[PDB]
Design a protein around this ligand. Structure first.
Ligand SMILES: CSCC[C@H](NC(C)=O)C(=O)O
Ligand SMILES: CSCC[C@H](NC(C)=O)C(=O)O
Ligand SMILES: [Mg+2]
Ligand SMILES: [Mg+2]
Lengths: 368, 367
C-alpha cells in the first residue's frame, strides 16, 4: 500500500490490582496506540513502553516523539510499504525498538486484514490454544503472596512467576514451595536487580527446583550471565538483554542463556520476534512469550506468536482480567489454563470504539 | 552542594564547512547547554547529542525531555549532592548516557569551582598540552579530499582521520597515500556502515598501514568485530559499542578491539570516561579522545581528559576554528600540533555572554 497516515492515541487504563516489580509500582497503565491508515484499510499497533524509562530507556513521551517526527514521516515518504520494508526504511534511526515495533505492528495488521490472513497464519502458528502462566508482583508480606498465588492457581494458571529483588527472593519461593509443593511450575524474575556479587544469594535458590531465573543482571551484562550460569543450578533466562535475533545468537554462543523470553516490542516487532524464535529453535534454546501488560490488541498478537512451535514453556500471556476490569477489545478468558489463538483477519480483534473513547486521553493525526 | 536549579538552553552554531559522515551531512550544530546553579556558584555542561537519532538513539529533543522531566527533578529532590553521587541518584533511569553526562559535567564543574580545582587535576592529568588530529569527512571527489587533507597537514594537525563508507573506502585512502606518503599517521572511521559480509572489501585496506579502523560494524555487534579482526590486518577500534567501562572490559575479553575511542558524553560522563581509560590501561589497550564537534566547553573538558597517561594516540579534539567561525568561549588554537590543557579552576573556561546570547535559540529555567 502507500500509507496514508497514522493516528496516534494516548490511553490510560485502570489496573485491577497494583503491580510491583524490582523497578517500581504501577496501578494505572499509560500506553500509546496507533491506527495506521492505508488505501487498503486500517491496522492497529500497541506500543509497549511505560510512562518513564525504568524497564528500558524508551518511554511513552519519547516513543510518541520519535514516532511523530522521524519514524512515521519516513514511512510516509516511502514509495512502497510492506511490513517487511518497515525495518530497512527505518534502519537509519538508531534504537527506538519499541516505537519501531508499534508502527510495524500497525502496518502488519493493516496489511494482513487486507489479505484476510491471521497474525497466527502469518507467523506460522501450529496450534489453536496456548498454556498461560501469570506473573505475580512483589507483595508487602508472605501471606498476601500466598493468598494471591492461591487465587491464580485456583483460576487454572499453569505456571507461577514471582517478581524478586534483593531482600525478597529466597523467603518468597520457600514460602510458595512449602504451601503449594513441588509439582507447581515456578520461576522467578529479577528485572536486572542483582549483580554477580549476589551469586551466593541466588545459589540459595538451587534447592527449590525453579524452571528458570529471568534476567538476574543488567541488560548490557551478557558475559556476567555466562559467569553466573557457571555458579548456579537454576537455568538462566534473558529478557531485557535480547533486543534482536543477533543478540540472541550472541548470548547463546557465549553460554549466557538457556531459555529466552520473547517480547515483540522489545525486539522491534512481531517480524523480528519470529526471527528470535527461529534463531533459538536452531540452537535448541526453548522460548516463551513475555507480556507488557498489553491491552487486547497486543495480547492478541502475543497469543498468536506464542502458538509457534518452539514456545515450549508457558508464557506470561494471562487473561485480560488479570490486569484490566474492562479490556478495549473482546477480552481473553482462560479455559483449562489455555488462551485460544485468534481467528479473523489481522490481529483477530479490534477496539470497541466506545470503550476506546472512554480511555483516550489524547488523539493526534500524523499525515503529509 | 545543594543544587538550586539548572538553566537549560538550546544553541545553534554554523559550521565553517559541511561535515559528512556515513550517516549524513551537517552544516549547523544544534546542541544543548546546561547551567547548574548552586548557592556557591555555577557550572556548565554540554550534551553531545545531535538533532536526530542518526549516530545513536539519543537526540536533542529526547535529551531535553529526559533532562527536564526526570534527570533534573531527581537531582533537585536530593539532600546534599556531588558529582560522584549523580550516578547513583540517576541509576533508576535506563540509558540516556549523553543526557546524564551533560548534567554530570555541569555538576562537576560546580563542585570543582568551589574547590578551585580544575578538570585536569580531578581527572588525573600528567601532561600540559596534548597532540591533536583532524577528522575529515566524505567528499564528492578524490581531488576535493587531497586538497582538504593537504590543508590540514599544513595547519600542523599531527594525524589524519578519514570518514569512510561502502563506495568511499579503498580509493580515498589509496589517493591519500600517493599524495602524502607512508609517513603521515592515517586512520579510517566507518561509523557502523559495513557488515561482516564486507570483510573482503575492508581487507583491501591491508596494504596501506592504517593505524586503526574505527567501528566498521554495528554498535551492538561486538562478536562481529572479534570475528572481523581475524579477517583483516588493520587494528580495530570501537567507538559506538563502548558505552561504559564494563562494555570495554567485555569487548577486550572477547578480543573485539585493540584500541578504544573515548567520548565522555557517549559513555555517560567524564567520571565514567576516566574509568574507561583505567580499564583500558589495565589491559594494555591504548585509548585516544574522540570529538562530537563540541563547543569550547566540551573541548576544554576533552583536552583535560585527553591528557591522562594512557591517551597515547592523538585525539580528534581539533582547534575551535576547525568547526566554527566563532566559538562561545576563548577559542582553542593549534600550537605545534598541540592544544593546551586549561588551567583555571573547574572546566577552566566559561561562555562569554555576548556570544552565547547571539547563538541561543531558547532557554528554560528548572527550579
Ligand atoms: C511492570 S513491567 C511488565 C514486564 C513483564 N512483567 C510482567 C510480570 O509480565 C516482564 O518484565 O516480565
Ligand atoms: C558529528 S558525527 C560524530 C562525531 C565523531 N566524528 C568526528 C570525526 O569527530 C565520531 O564519528 O567519531
Ligand atoms: Mg521479565
Ligand atoms: Mg566514530
Amino acid at each position: 500500500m502507500k500509507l496514508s497516515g497514522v493516528e496516534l492515541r494516548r490511553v490510560q487504563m485502570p489496573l485491577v490490582a497494583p503491580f510491583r516489580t524490582s523497578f517500581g509500582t504501577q496501578s494505572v497503565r499509560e500506553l500509546l496506540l496507533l491506527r495506521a491508515v492505508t488505501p487498503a484499510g486500517e491496522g492497529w499497533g500497541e506500543c509497549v513502553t511505560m510512562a518513564g524509562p525504568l524497564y528500558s530507556s524508551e518511554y511513552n513521551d519519547g516513543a510518541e516523539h520519535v514516532l511523530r517526527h522521524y519514524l512515521i514521516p519516513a514511512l510516509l515518504a516511502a514509495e512502497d510499504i510492506t511490513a517487511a520494508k518497515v525495518t530497512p526504511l527505518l534502519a537509519k534511526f538508531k534504537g527506538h525498538r519499541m516505537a519501531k515495533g508499534a508502527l510495524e505492528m500497525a502496518v502488519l495488521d493493516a496489511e494482513l486484514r487486507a489479505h484476510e490472513r491471521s497474525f497466527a497464519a502469518e507467523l506460522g502458528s501450529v496450534r489453536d490454544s496456548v498454556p498461560c502462566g501469570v506473573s505475580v508482583g512483589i507483595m508487602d508480606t508472605i501471606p498476601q503472596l500466598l493468598d494471591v498465588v492461591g487465587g491464580y492457581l485456583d483460576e487454572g494458571y499453569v505456571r507461577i512467576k514471582l517478581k524478586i529483588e534483593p531482600g525478597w527472593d529466597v523467603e518468597p519461593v520457600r514460602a510458595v514451595r512449602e504451601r503449594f509443593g513441588d509439582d507447581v511450575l515456578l520461576q522467578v524474575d529479577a528485572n536486572t536487580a542483582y549483580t554477580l556479587g549476589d551469586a551466593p544469594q541466588l545459589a540459595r535458590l538451587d534447592p527449590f527446583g525453579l524452571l528458570l531465573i529471568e534476567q538476574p543482571l543488567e541488560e548490557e551484562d551478557v558475559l556476567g550471565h555466562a559467569e553466573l550460569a557457571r555458579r548456579i543450578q537454576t537455568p538462566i533466562c534473558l529478557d531485557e538483554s535480547i533486543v534482536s535475533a543477533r543478540a540472541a545468537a550472541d548470548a547463546i554462543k557465549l553460554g549466557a542463556v538457556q531459555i529466552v523470553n520473547i517480547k515483540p516490542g522489545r525486539v522491534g516487532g512481531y517480524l523480528e520476534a519470529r526471527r528470535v524464535h527461529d534463531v533459538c529453535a536452531a540452537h535448541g534454546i526453548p522460548v516463551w512469550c513475555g507480556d507488557m501488560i498489553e491491552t487486547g490488541l497486543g495480547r492478541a498478537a502475543n497469543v498468536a506468536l506464542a502458538s509457534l512451535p518452539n514456545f515450549t514453556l508457558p508464557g506470561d500471556t494471562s487473561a485480560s482480567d488479570r490486569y484490566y476490569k474492562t479490556d478495549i477489545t473482546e477480552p481473553f478468558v482462560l479455559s483449562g489454563g489455555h488462551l485460544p489463538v485468534p481467528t479473523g483477519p489481522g490481529l483477530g480483534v479490534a477496539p470497541i470504539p466506545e470503550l476506546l473513547d472512554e480511555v483516550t486521553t489524547a488523539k493526534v493525526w500524523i499525515g503529509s
